[PDB]
Amino acid sequence: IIGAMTALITPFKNGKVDEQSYARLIKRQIENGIDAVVPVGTTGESATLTHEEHRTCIEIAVETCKGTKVKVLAGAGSNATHQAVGLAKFAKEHGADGILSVAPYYNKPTQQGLYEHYKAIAQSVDIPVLLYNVPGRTGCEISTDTIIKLFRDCENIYGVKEASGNIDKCVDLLAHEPRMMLISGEDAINYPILSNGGKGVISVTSNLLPDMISALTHFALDENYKEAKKINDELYNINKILFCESNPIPIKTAMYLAGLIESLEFRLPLCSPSKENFAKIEEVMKKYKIKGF
Amino acid sequence: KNIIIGAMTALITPFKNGKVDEQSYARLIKRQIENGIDAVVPVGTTGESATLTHEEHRTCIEIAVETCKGTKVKVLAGAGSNATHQAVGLAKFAKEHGADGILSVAPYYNKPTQQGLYEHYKAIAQSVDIPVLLYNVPGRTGCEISTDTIIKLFRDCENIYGVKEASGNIDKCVDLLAHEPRMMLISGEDAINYPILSNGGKGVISVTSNLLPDMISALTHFALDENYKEAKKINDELYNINKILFCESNPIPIKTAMYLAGLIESLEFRLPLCSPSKENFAKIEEVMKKYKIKGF
Numbered sequence: 001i002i003g004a005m006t007a008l009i010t011p012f013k014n015g016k017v018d019e020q021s022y023a024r025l026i027k028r029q030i031e032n033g034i035d036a037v038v039p040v041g042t043t044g045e046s047a048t049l050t051h052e053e054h055r056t057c058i059e060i061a062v063e064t065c066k067g068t069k070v071k072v073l074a075g076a077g078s079n080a081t082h083q084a085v086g087l088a089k090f091a092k093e094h095g096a097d098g099i100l101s102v103a104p105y106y107n108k109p110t111q112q113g114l115y116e117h118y119k120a121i122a123q124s125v126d127i128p129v130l131l132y133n134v135p136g137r138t139g140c141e142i143s144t145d146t147i148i149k150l151f152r153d154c155e156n157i158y159g160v161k162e163a164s165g166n167i168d169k170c171v172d173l174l175a176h177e178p179r180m181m182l183i184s185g186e187d188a189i190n191y192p193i194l195s196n197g198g199k200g201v202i203s204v205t206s207n208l209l210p211d212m213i214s215a216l217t218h219f220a221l222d223e224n225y226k227e228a229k230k231i232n233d234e235l236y237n238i239n240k241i242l243f244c245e246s247n248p249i250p251i252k253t254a255m256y257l258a259g260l261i262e263s264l265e266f267r268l269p270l271c272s273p274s275k276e277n278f279a280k281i282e283e284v285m286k287k288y289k290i291k292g293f
Numbered sequence: 294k295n296i297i298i299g300a301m302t303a304l305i306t307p308f309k310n311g312k313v314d315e316q317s318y319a320r321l322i323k324r325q326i327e328n329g330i331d332a333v334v335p336v337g338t339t340g341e342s343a344t345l346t347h348e349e350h351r352t353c354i355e356i357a358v359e360t361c362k363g364t365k366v367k368v369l370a371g372a373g374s375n376a377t378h379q380a381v382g383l384a385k386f387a388k389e390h391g392a393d394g395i396l397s398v399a400p401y402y403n404k405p406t407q408q409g410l411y412e413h414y415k416a417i418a419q420s421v422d423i424p425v426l427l428y429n430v431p432g433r434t435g436c437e438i439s440t441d442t443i444i445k446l447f448r449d450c451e452n453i454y455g456v457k458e459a460s461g462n463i464d465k466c467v468d469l470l471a472h473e474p475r476m477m478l479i480s481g482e483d484a485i486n487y488p489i490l491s492n493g494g495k496g497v498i499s500v501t502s503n504l505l506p507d508m509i510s511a512l513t514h515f516a517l518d519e520n521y522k523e524a525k526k527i528n529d530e531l532y533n534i535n536k537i538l539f540c541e542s543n544p545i546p547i548k549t550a551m552y553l554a555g556l557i558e559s560l561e562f563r564l565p566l567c568s569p570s571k572e573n574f575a576k577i578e579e580v581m582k583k584y585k586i587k588g589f
């Protein structure tokens with residue numbers, strides 16, 4: 001799975017997942033050229049969803065994408081490998097087109113550990129598995145050597161979502177293993193990653209501006225770097241402001257400000273932004289045309 | 294404030310055939326008690342909290358509580374979570390099953406803001422009536438409890454009595470105790486146990502004490518009595534083992550050392566954790582030779 005993809009926010013209403021809004025947000029993604037959706041990633045507050053909720057989000061999404069050509073890359077990562085295998089199987093059993101699997105967080109496995117963790121996951125299913133490196137959140141980094149070995153050693157492993165701010169590593173990955181699918185995990189540098197041969201994005205910004213992110217990715221895949229860079233440059237201010245506080249606090253605030261969700265609700269320890277950052281997000285949004293439903 | 298201080302151990306969790314070796318767990322805790330340790334921390338990072346089931350997590354806390362009854366040794370139960378609802382539940386559990394207090398690591402992976410951290414710990418503290426020790430380890434969580442947030446929580450919440458600091462930032466340790474000297478600063482970094490204690494820290498939550506509880510015990514008690522020459526001498530002696538126990542991610546080296554010492558049956562982890570490199574295995578074995586390891 002490649003192309004423009006959205007790390008879906010998870011809207012809450014009165015402390016529960018707003019399931020109708022969840023399906024409605026995914027339809028809006030489909031209407032605006034998105035190629036795949038990622039239920040229950042970091043942006044979807046996977047850490048604070050119950051097992052049941054995690055499972056249901058994937059189900060809505062698979063169901064809502066059914067019939068369209070939009071794929072579901074299910075959030076299935078865990079820092080407990082038994083758990084990650086579990087999630088992988090669930091996704092497969094419930095029709096996900098594939099899986100996203102974040103590098104274990106908090107426990108800091110070694111490179112050998114990561115290899116084992118992912119081999120376990122990959123062998124438990126037969127759908128594509130997309131590796132996810134975000135060391136600022138996990139405390140560990142999947143080495144370039146480890147990524148490559150996994151790609152070559154495990155049939156299902158087809159690439160990595162990179163959120164490390166390290167374009168050198170992106171060169172390193174595609175120079176030594178050009179067959180893998182490098183996916184941008186940091187919206188601000190979507191174009192530089194695509195222009196080095198990246199084949200997709202898993203975007204926070206596309207929650208609010210899916211048409212802009214989808215166009216950017218498709219310009220780039222069609223080798224119109226001029227127009228892809230144009231959108232990337234235009235999106236920089238919003239791409240930065242969406243991380244003025246830890247994601248998904250700004251994007252949910254933006255979605256609520258645009259009237260796209262009913263309630264600016266998080267699950268603790270996530271919370272509302274500062275009032276000043278709230279106003280900063282509101283101000284930056286005003287320079288972009290935000291698609292409705 | 295009610296407090297839990299002194300020399301404390303972040304207990305490893307031994308596995309046998311993919312199950313918690315509950316008999317070895319109790320035996321290991323008794324070894325800590327008999328070597329001068331003041332409190333034990335079941336199921337922290339060193340106890341592989343991430344890969345235990347909820348039931349196993351509960352079981353290890355209960356085993357700790359039961360093993361320390363009839364002694365002066367306290368149980369500071371590992372109760373952290375990156376989901377506030379789960380952390381409150383763990384705090385409640387620890388309270389209801391006889392723990393003396395809880396340790397609660399800063400939420401990992403989802404990187405809450407300072408406002409969110411405040412709210413997170415306030416909900417935990419307001420849910421029980423036993424001491425709560427914050428735990429700051431930004432290298433593992435991806436976030437930091439700022440000094441201001443720590444102090445605000447200490448002053449605003451009755452049961453929050455201090456912080457376990459594992460951030461290699463002695464400046465912050467000065468900052469903390471210079472602006473709020475009533476709090477209990479606990480070293481979460483073995484190599485710098487003495488510097489933290491010598492600045493007014495009141496205890497350690499140690500990985501090395503799994504292997505050398507008597508030495509960590511003496512270091513802390515020497516330091517608490519302001520016998521800084523003797524405390525520093527032990528800290529200096531311990532530096533080599535303190536560092537080698539993090540050649541690979543904790544608790545991979547300490548469990549390796551415990552296995553080499555014959556203190557656990559199997560060198561078993563739960564994935565994504567795994568045995569160390571063959572090279573680091575030998576390095577740990579070599580460093581160990583320079584220390585006298587207490588038996589059972």
Ligand SMILES: NCCCC[C@@](N)(CC[C@](N)(CCCCN)C(=O)O)C(=O)O
Pocket residue numbers: 046047048049050051054078079080106342343344345346347350374375376402
């Ligand atoms: N997607 C919904 C599940 C969320 C579970 C958890 N909050 C905690 C994961 C866990 N491995 C649970 C350990 C439970 C026993 N201590 C962790 O806290 O590390 C996470 O993965 O962030």
Ligand SMILES: [Mg+2]
Pocket residue numbers: 003033034035069
């Ligand atoms: Mg398409």
Ligand SMILES: [Mg+2]
Pocket residue numbers: 041042075076077078100101102132
């Ligand atoms: Mg994931």
Ligand SMILES: [Mg+2]
Pocket residue numbers: 518
């Ligand atoms: Mg004395």
